[PDB]
A paper describes a structure:
The Mex67–Mtr2 complex (NXF1–NXT1 in metazoans and small bristles in Drosophila melanogastor) is the principal mRNA-export factor in Sacccharomyces cerevisiae. Mex67/NXF1 is a modular protein constructed from four domains: an RNA-recognition motif (RRM) domain, a leucine-rich repeat (LRR) domain, a nuclear transport factor 2-like (NTF2L) domain and an ubiquitin-associated (UBA) domain. Mtr2 is a ∼15–20 kDa protein that also has an NTF2-like fold and forms a tight heterodimeric complex with the Mex67 NTF2L domain.
Classically, binding of the RNA cargo has been attributed to the RRM and LRR domains because together these domains are sufficient for Homo sapiens NXF1 to bind the viral RNA CTE (constitutive transport element) sequence motif. d for the ctMex67LRR-NTF2L–Mtr2 (RRM domain deletion) was 6.8 µM, whereas that for ctMex67RRM-LRR (NTF2L–Mtr2 region deletion) was 5.5 µM. These data indicated that as in S. cerevisiae the RRM, LRR and NTF2L–Mtr2 regions all contribute to RNA binding by ctMex67–Mtr2.
Residue numbers in the entry: 196 to 223, 237 to 359
The structure:
């Protein structure tokens, strides 16, 4: 199991992009199954600094995620995450993201394309407010680099 999960994580890690691709896990999801992955990624690195530098980006795209509570511990495991892809899930409104208020303080790029929350009137305004380092939301620049240097 640990061997199988470790092998899966290795196959899904792109060193060149510093990216851990956890998209579409159901095709090879559950909070306790996700917690297990997070425990394994935490155990990989003896130095948190190396972990922080190795995994700068994560995709959780296409996982039928209804609430970020489902994958909450990503915020604990990778507090210095810079890029996050949550595209192609089913996050319906801002309350489905609010469990990550005050987390991902260093996140610079966020993708929510394909989630219903993106079409609500206060979407971009609130997401900008909640994540102070965010420069790109769905490919749209929402903070200039100088703006972000001050946020």
């Amino acid at each position: 199991t640990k061997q199988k999960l470790t092998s899966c994580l290795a196959r899904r890690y792109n060193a060149e992009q510093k990216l851990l691709d956890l998209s579409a896990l159901g095709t090879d999801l559950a909070e306790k199954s996700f917690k297990a992955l997070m425990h394994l990624v935490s155990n990989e690195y003896k130095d948190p600094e190396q972990k922080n530098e190795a995994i700068q980006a994560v995709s959780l795209a296409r996982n039928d995620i209804l609430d970020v509570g489902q994958v909450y511990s990503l915020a604990v495991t990778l507090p210095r995450l810079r890029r996050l892809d949550l595209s192609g899930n089913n996050l319906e409104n801002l309350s489905k993201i609010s469990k990550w208020q005050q987390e991902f303080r260093f996140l610079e790029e966020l993708h929510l394309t394909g989630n219903p929350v993106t079409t609500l009137p206060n979407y971009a305004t609130e997401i900008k407010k909640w994540f102070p380092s965010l420069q790109i939301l769905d490919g749209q620049q929402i903070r200039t680099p100088q703006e972000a240097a001050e946020s």
